[PDB]
Amino acid sequence: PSPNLPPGFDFTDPAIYAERLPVAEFAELRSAAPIWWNGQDPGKGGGFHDGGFWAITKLNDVKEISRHSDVFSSYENGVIPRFKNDIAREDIEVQRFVMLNMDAPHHTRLRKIISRGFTPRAVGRLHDELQERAQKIAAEAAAAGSGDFVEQVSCELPLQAIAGLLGVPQEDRGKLFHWSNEMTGNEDPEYAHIDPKASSAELIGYAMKMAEEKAKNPADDIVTQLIQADIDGEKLSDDEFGFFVVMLAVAGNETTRNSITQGMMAFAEHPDQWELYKKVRPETAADEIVRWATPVTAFQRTALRDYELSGVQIKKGQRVVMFYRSANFDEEVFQDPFTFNILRNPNPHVGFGGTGAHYCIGANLARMTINLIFNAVADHMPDLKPISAPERLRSGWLNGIKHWQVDYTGR
Numbered sequence: 543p544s545p546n547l548p549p550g551f552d553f554t555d556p557a558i559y560a561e562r563l564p565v566a567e568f569a570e571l572r573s574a575a576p577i578w579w580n581g582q583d584p585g586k587g588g589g590f591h592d593g594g595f596w597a598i599t600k601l602n603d604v605k606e607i608s609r610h611s612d613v614f615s616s617y618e619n620g621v622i623p624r625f626k627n628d629i630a631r632e633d634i635e636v637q638r639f640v641m642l643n644m645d646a647p648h649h650t651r652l653r654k655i656i657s658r659g660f661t662p663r664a665v666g667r668l669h670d671e672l673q674e675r676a677q678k679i680a681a682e683a684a685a686a687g688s689g690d691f692v693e694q695v696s697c698e699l700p701l702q703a704i705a706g707l708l709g710v711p712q713e714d715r716g717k718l719f720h721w722s723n724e725m726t727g728n729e730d731p732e733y734a735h736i737d738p739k740a741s742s743a744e745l746i747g748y749a750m751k752m753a754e755e756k757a758k759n760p761a762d763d764i765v766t767q768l769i770q771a772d773i774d775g776e777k778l779s780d781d782e783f784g785f786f787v788v789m790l791a792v793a794g795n796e797t798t799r800n801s802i803t804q805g806m807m808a809f810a811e812h813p814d815q816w817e818l819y820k821k822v823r824p825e826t827a828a829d830e831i832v833r834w835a836t837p838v839t840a841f842q843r844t845a846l847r848d849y850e851l852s853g854v855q856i857k858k859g860q861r862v863v864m865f866y867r868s869a870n871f872d873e874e875v876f877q878d879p880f881t882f883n884i885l886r887n888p889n890p891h892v893g894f895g896g897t898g899a900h901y902c903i904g905a906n907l908a909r910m911t912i913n914l915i916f917n918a919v920a921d922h923m924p925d926l927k928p929i930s931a932p933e934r935l936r937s938g939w940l941n942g943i944k945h946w947q948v949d950y951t952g953r
């Protein structure tokens with residue numbers, strides 16, 4: 543039988559996510575139609591005009607699609623499954639200039655080069671400065687007494703991690719943070735005036751100036767490694783560095799922010815886990831927070847050929863949308879998925895995507911950011927208590943929290 547969903551329900555409808563996560567609806571698909579055609583009416587496809595997509599709700603199917611990038615393309619339609627309904631096709635395709643929306647072999651070459659920026663050593667070199675910054679963030683928020691946890695706790699450390707990785711001098715971090723904040727959320731009325739196109743252009747201009755400067759004066763950052771030729775002359779051109787910086791400014795910011803906000807929401811809802819976190823400070827917490835938060839609800843692929851997936855014939859040209867928010871609560875993979883368990887180990891969540899060519903290169907930087915900020919929160923505001931309900935972001939594919947009023951002193 544067909545799944546018990548309202549007629550015309552669209553799992554990428556931003557109007558849903560402005561209010562809630564459609565948890566019951568995803569669970570109904572997993573039970574009754576784990577691969578399900580999500581029809582979309584004319585003009586209501588969020589920028590795609592193909593009649594709908596296949597909703598992918600099971601973790602094993604998300605992994606299969608993610609591993610078979612030879613069939614399931616990121617380039618063909620990009621990986622973001624929802625824009626404003628009137629977005630020009632050319633503005634979707636301009637996103638093919640970042641690694642996330644490339645197929646092999648172009649993706650292979652870029653990822654090999656960019657690897658230089660995300661070596662364990664390079665990320666580990668940011669540990670002590672990010673730890674110092676996390677403690678300062680939490681101390682300053684606790685001193686304010688109460689306020690918006692998103693803005694006073696969750697927001698700054700992911701941005702400082704971007705700045706430290708790129709070696710952005712302190713006097714430039716204000717403008718870098720502004721550009722990065724202008725990239726996300728434009729379907730929400732609170733951000734109706736942001737201009738991601740103009741921000742991206744300014745960022746490219748800034749980043750190409752930086753590439754030209756750092757080739758003269760190599761510095762203790764990843765930039766020197768990215769633009770230095772190897773034995774075979776491989777390196778980012780200045781404009782490719784520009785597109786990488788756009789990608790980093792975009793990717794490195796609000797998904798980690800939202801994991802922090804939603805991790806602390808989870809702790810407010812599960813006091814025994816908060817008590818246990820404060821005592822043991824287990825770094826397994828970061829992965830359970832990312833599973834619980836699933837900051838990217840969904841990314842899509844496009845089939846380059848007919849492909850049979852778990853008994854369903856996907857046709858060439860059709861989109862498949864990987865609902866990480868569903869897969870991360872898959873009863874066949876997780877023991878008690880709706881239990882928040884900061885000791886869950888192993889934790890094979892797909893919050894950073896399915897394993898494969900496009901697996902999040904920032905995963906360990908994200909986990910570090912999360913572990914450092916929650917240690918600082920436990921140190922400086924162990925007794926925080928929510929004051930009022932979170933305000934969610936209107937987005938068809940990002941799970942965002944715009945605002946959350948909290949009493950840091952708990953009294």
Ligand code: HEM
Pocket residue numbers: 608616621641642643653704789790793794795797798801832836837838841892893894895896899900901902903904905907908
């Ligand atoms: C909790 C935070 C984060 C989440 C939930 C997350 C989520 C994801 C997901 C789901 C993908 C899969 C892309 C796909 O398969 O289509 C991805 C890829 C990517 N992430 Fe993240 N990410 C996070 C943090 C970061 C950070 C901090 C950075 C960099 C500073 C970053 C940079 C990237 C890049 C560049 C890719 C593309 C990799 C490629 O295409 O080869 N991400 N991320």
Ligand SMILES: COc1ccc(-c2ccncc2)cc1
Pocket residue numbers: 642725726727792793794797902
């Ligand atoms: C607003 O647009 C985007 C927002 C976030 C991402 C992202 C990709 C990979 N990892 C983390 C975040 C990409 C685009």
Ligand SMILES: [Cl-]
Pocket residue numbers: 554582587588589590595623624
């Ligand atoms: Cl769509």
Ligand SMILES: [Cl-]
Pocket residue numbers: none
């Ligand atoms: Cl094309």
Ligand SMILES: [Cl-]
Pocket residue numbers: 625626629728
């Ligand atoms: Cl848009």
Ligand SMILES: [Cl-]
Pocket residue numbers: 848849850
């Ligand atoms: Cl097949």
Ligand SMILES: [Cl-]
Pocket residue numbers: 875876877886887888889
């Ligand atoms: Cl488990």
